[PDB]
């Protein structure tokens, strides 16, 4: 089986250079062009360039000349891409993908890595504040606001997972360097506030786990 295994999520400071990698297996690394592709998270796919590891011939999108540097290490069947002078515009998921058809090529990509997320930010790891959402029908909706954290991700559960039906956790939005997200849960009015409802928030990056009970307000 052909497999392309890319290195993990990278956080980088603005103005820096980052280097990411793509480990190829299941085929002769030196006989196929390895391409890289950028996906900014509200748009499609942009071709960066390619390297032929057999002789290190390279080819770059004009838009990425001076930005990306492609290299490959034969002994370890690993391709690298180094991106320079990082800005917010470089935050994206980057894929490595093999081109079908060996050196002769095809400009079709038959195998893809799982992607590497690059997040460029001057923010350093900081835990969220978790705020209860209580209102002030057969059903009541409650929520949690998980605000001002970095980096992604956080996980949110409700009553430790026993409330899965009727839960919505929304994708985080970026405000002023930091992420904020919300999550809602809906239960029978018969159960809240008679019973307890709690959002369990975990921010692995800051080793934080917070339990926030949702209190009635008056």
């Amino acid at each position: 089986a052909v497999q392309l295994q890319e290195s993990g999520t990278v956080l980088a400071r603005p103005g820096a250079s980052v280097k990411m990698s793509c480990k190829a297996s299941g085929y002769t690394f030196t006989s196929y062009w390895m391409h890289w592709v950028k996906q900014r998270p509200g748009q499609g796919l942009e071709w960066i360039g390619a390297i032929y590891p057999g002789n290190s011939d390279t080819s770059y999108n004009q838009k990425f000349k001076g930005k990306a540097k492609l290299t490959a290490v034969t002994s370890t069947s690993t391709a690298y891409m180094e991106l320079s002078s990082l800005t917010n515009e470089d935050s994206a998921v980057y894929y490595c993908t093999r081109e079908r058809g060996l050196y002769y090529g095809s400009s079709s990509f038959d195998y893809w890595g799982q992607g590497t997320t690059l997040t460029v930010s001057s923010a350093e790891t900081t835990p969220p504040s978790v705020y209860p959402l209580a209102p002030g029908s057969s059903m009541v909706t409650l929520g949690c606001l998980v605000k001002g954290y970095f980096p992604e991700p956080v996980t949110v559960t409700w009553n430790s997972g026993s409330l899965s039906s009727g839960v919505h956790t929304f994708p985080a939005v970026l405000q002023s360097d930091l992420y904020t997200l919300s999550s809602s849960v809906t239960v029978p009015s018969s159960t809240w506030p008679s019973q307890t409802v709690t959002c369990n928030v975990a921010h692995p990056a800051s080793s934080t786990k917070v339990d926030k009970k949702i209190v009635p307000r008056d």
Binding site: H35, W112, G115, P132, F170
Partner: protein, 213 residues
Amino acid sequence: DIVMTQTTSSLSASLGDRVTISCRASQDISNYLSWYQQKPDGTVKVLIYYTSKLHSGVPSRFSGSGSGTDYSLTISNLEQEDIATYFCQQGNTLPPTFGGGTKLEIKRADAAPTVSIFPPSSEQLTSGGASVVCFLNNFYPKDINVKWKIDGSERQNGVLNSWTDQDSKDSTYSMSSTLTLTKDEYERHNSYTCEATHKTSTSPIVKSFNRNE
């Protein structure tokens, strides 16, 4: 660069349907066109290359056709696993270029949003900030607009929105909208209102929170 345009960004369908996704190149691309499938976990697979050749291991319910500038991917009998985003890509001329992508969704009956609004918590107010949060849950179709009003006055600044992808169980969508103000400005007003415009209603769907309550 050759421009690739996929005819739509979003396409509805029912399981068991025949589905067709098309794209168009800005010049003839000589059948050098491939189709890729991207799933929500970010993973990517090629389905078709050179217009109509099926990649090994890809189910033969996928097929491709076309010539010149115009190409289509067809799924003969849509399965659940096929709900994904599909990209076309030309390899006629460097640089290789991709279409903008077409995301499939499951078709279903219209459903009105369930709207809930929430005041800032006491914990947040102590920090000097105030966020009012509005959830608009389980609606369909996905198209929806949210307007915030403070004591009757429409408010755009300080609003952030977030949308879920289509629910795997009931095929609806949800949205969250948050208005964030300083504690001071928040305390200077009483009535906070989230109003949704959605196909399911001629008038706005309005939920309000009033500091008098």
